[PDB]
Design a protein around this ligand. Structure first.
Ligand SMILES: O=c1ccn([C@@H]2O[C@H](COP(=O)(O)OP(=O)(O)O)[C@@H](O)[C@H]2O)c(=O)[nH]1
Ligand SMILES: O=c1ccn([C@@H]2O[C@H](COP(=O)(O)OP(=O)(O)O)[C@@H](O)[C@H]2O)c(=O)[nH]1
Lengths: 286, 290
């Protein structure tokens, strides 16, 4: 009944797949000379990083051209476990030597653009306990097969969370209502074209996902964004103080894209907030 | 900046209010106190809340009203049996058609009360305590310059909307107000001077709108907070919390001039305040300006 509703319905019809059952073989055949890089950001994920790598490794040399763990300064056994599991481990410093690192996830994903060569870049979190081998095929399907798509968001069915449903989706309803069609805007499993990703700033820390979604929308609208169901995953039960820090940075990043000033004041406890994006990687490479 | 917050907590926050009913009665100095419970279909709890306040009626408390918001259950009869006067939205402000939501109820109660101080207490509380009203009025009666008192609950050793939505948004847009522990709480008291003169946000936005307007107009030191006791976080469905969050966002955006689309969640979202009650009840308001 609203303009938002109407666009959502058609966008789901065209750009959302609850059964993204493309085969690896057909996706390989559709690459048409494009290459695919998979990047796992990792900070102290020794218990899970190898398991994630193991689910992607069978695609290496076929659908996937490179599988990189972009280490974020781990002090546990993340790097060596990623090595043994069959990934290429690259530090923030090796990825982009000319810029000093700053903390947070967004920095890692941004730097990975300088360390990878794929025409399509896929991000998968390294803290996943139950990774499924079809994540990468499902994420790249719309990029390889669907005209005009530059960003694919992977969502999970449940057997979003609190920040998604209380913070991100309500703020998008207020500020960019067409984007409320995206089921899991904060999700860490997603893929984009190099053309898109090199051309947008990267928000810091836990702002990176929402920043990329809004910057893509502001340039290209809903037509360029797709989503795919990766399967069933249970909600993680994270501490409220962590969720609040995430909510504060999601707010800061949304406000920075939507014309709202932000005090720069992090959370008052009885938190880390940065409004400093990294510039488009095109300004340094390519 | 934490110096501003530290000083406010030192002077304007009470974890253990010491006040007795007798000392508060003795401090009224001719001021009267109205207690208003908004109620929409609260038959299971409204009587218990009223019962905790009724012993104060005729002493500390001058009026005890349940503002019924269109209930179809036994809310009215049970509130009356417990000793409250029950006033419908229509009776409170008869010439203005009612609109839905909590903010409407609190706003209308201003036309149906005579107190120099108005105390709001939710009627859905499972474990009300008789010292709520004394604690909420203490800073209004015994401190100087306080106009709004927010009652907070200590938690066993705010909720999800408070900590993920309200506090982070205040950090971004009204940073001093992050010192308020439970900005969305429904137990609070205000002066007639303040409440009659501010617009009232609709629905679930009413509390945050009043907090921000008080802050802007009267300042941080006009706001106080008091610990009402230990209460466990209420476990509500996420969809309900999301609808509340969306309205909190809308009201804070209204108070900051952020274009809000008005688009709800696939939920009710209003961007329209009710005007200050002194615009519709000017003679009542003037009679109470004292
Ligand atoms: O500074 C950071 C923060 C996070 N991450 C990675 O980004 C993903 C999401 O991080 P989050 O903090 O949400 O999860 P957690 O680190 O608690 O598992 C995980 O794979 C982290 O290892 C990272 O590489 N650098
Ligand atoms: O339109 C409304 C919505 C709420 N309330 C009252 O305001 C308080 C807070 O409402 P909430 O919806 O949080 O509680 P619930 O109505 O779910 O018990 C309660 O005493 C409600 O009865 C009201 O009078 N009118």
């Amino acid at each position: 009944l609203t303009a938002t509703d109407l666009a959502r319905h058609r966008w789901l019809t065209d750009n959302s797949w609850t059964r993204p059952t493309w085969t690896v073989a057909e996706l390989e055949a559709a690459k048409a000379g494009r290459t695919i890089s998979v990047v796992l950001p990792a900070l102290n994920e020794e218990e899970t990083v190898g398991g994630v790598v193991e689910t992607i490794r069978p695609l290496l040399g076929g659908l996937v051209d490179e599988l990189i763990v972009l280490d974020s300064g781990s002090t546990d056994d993340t790097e060596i476990r990623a090595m043994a599991a069959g990934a290429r481990v690259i530090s923030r410093e090796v990825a982009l030597p000319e810029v000093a690192p700053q903390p947070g996830k967004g920095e890692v994903l941004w730097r990975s653009l300088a360390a990878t060569t794929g025409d399509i870049i896929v991000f998968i979190d390294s803290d996943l306990i139950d990774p499924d081998p079809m994540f990468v095929p499902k994420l790249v399907g719309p990029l390889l097969l669907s005209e005009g798509v530059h960003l694919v968001k992977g969502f999970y069915r449940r057997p979003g969370g609190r920040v998604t449903e209380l913070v991100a989706r309500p703020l998008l309803a207020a500020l960019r209502p067409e984007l409320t069609c995206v089921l899991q805007p904060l999700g860490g499993e997603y893929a984009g074209t190099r053309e898109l990703l090199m051309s947008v700033p990267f928000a810091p820390g836990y702002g990176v996902e929402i920043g990329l979604l809004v910057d893509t929308y502001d340039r290209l609208g809903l037509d360029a964004i797709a989503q795919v169901n990766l399967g069933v995953r249970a909600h993680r039960n994270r501490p409220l103080t962590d969720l609040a820090a995430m909510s504060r940075q999601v707010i800061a990043t949304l406000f920075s894209r939507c014309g709202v000033p932000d005090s720069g004041v992090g959370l008052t406890q009885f938190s880390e907030v940065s409004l400093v994006d990294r510039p488009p990687m095109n300004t340094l490479r390519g």
